[PDB]
Amino acid sequence: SSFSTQTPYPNLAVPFFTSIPNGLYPSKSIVISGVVLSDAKRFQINLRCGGDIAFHLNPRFDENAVVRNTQINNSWGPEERSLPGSMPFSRGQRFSVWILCEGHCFKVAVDGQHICEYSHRLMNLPDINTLEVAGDIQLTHVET
Numbered sequence: 001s002s003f004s005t006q007t008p009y010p011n012l013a014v015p016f017f018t019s020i021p022n023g024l025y026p027s028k029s030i031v032i033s034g035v036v037l038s039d040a041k042r043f044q045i046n047l048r049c050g051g052d053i054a055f056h057l058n059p060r061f062d063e064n065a066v067v068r069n070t071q072i073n074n075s076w077g078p079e080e081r082s083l084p085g086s087m088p089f090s091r092g093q094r095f096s097v098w099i100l101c102e103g104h105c106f107k108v109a110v111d112g113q114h115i116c117e118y119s120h121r122l123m124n125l126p127d128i129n130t131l132e133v134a135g136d137i138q139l140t141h142v143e144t
C-alpha cells in the first residue's frame with residue numbers, strides 16, 4: 001500500500017539530499033523515517049564526503065540483506081552483512097533508522113532494534129557532511 005506514484009511531502013522526494021550540520025562528530029545522531037515501497041527492490045542511505053561514501057547502508061529485499069560498505073575514490077571496499085536477527089525492513093512497512101556517530105564507529109538501529117556497528121573507515125568526520133537517501137522508499141522525516 002505504498003508506491004512511488006504517491007505524492008511526496010514537500011522537499012521529501014527521492015533521491016533526497018540534505019546537509020549534516022557541522023558534519024559528523026562523536027555523539028552526532030541522524031534519524032531517517034519513511035516507508036518501504038510495497039514492490040521495493042532496494043534502498044540506500046549514504047553519508048557522503050566529497051566524492052566518497054563514508055557509510056553506505058543498503059537494505060536489499062531481493063537478497064533479504066542489509067549491506068554496509070564504504071566507497072573511496074569510486075571503488076567499494078569489503079561488505080559487512082551480519083545481522084543479529086531477521087531482516088529488519090519489510091516491503092510496505094514503516095521504518096525509523098537511527099544512526100549514531102561515535103568516535104570510532106557508527107551504531108545503527110532500526111525501529112529501536114540495534115542492527116549493526118560499523119567501524120569508521122573514513123575518519124575525517126566533519127567532511128562527512130551530506131546525507132543521501134535513495135531507492136524504493138517514501139520518506140517522511142529526516143533529522144541530521
Ligand SMILES: OC[C@H]1O[C@@H](O[C@H]2[C@H](O)[C@@H](O)[C@@H](O)O[C@@H]2CO)[C@H](O)[C@@H](O)[C@H]1O
Pocket residue numbers: 056058067068069076079
Ligand atoms: O557493497 C555496496 C555495493 O555493492 C554492489 O554490489 C556488489 C555486490 O553486493 C557484491 O556481492 C559483489 O558482487 O560486488 C558487487 C559490486 O561491488 C552494488 O552494486 C552497489 O550498488 C553497492 O550497494
Ligand code: NA
Pocket residue numbers: 135136
Ligand atoms: Na526503484
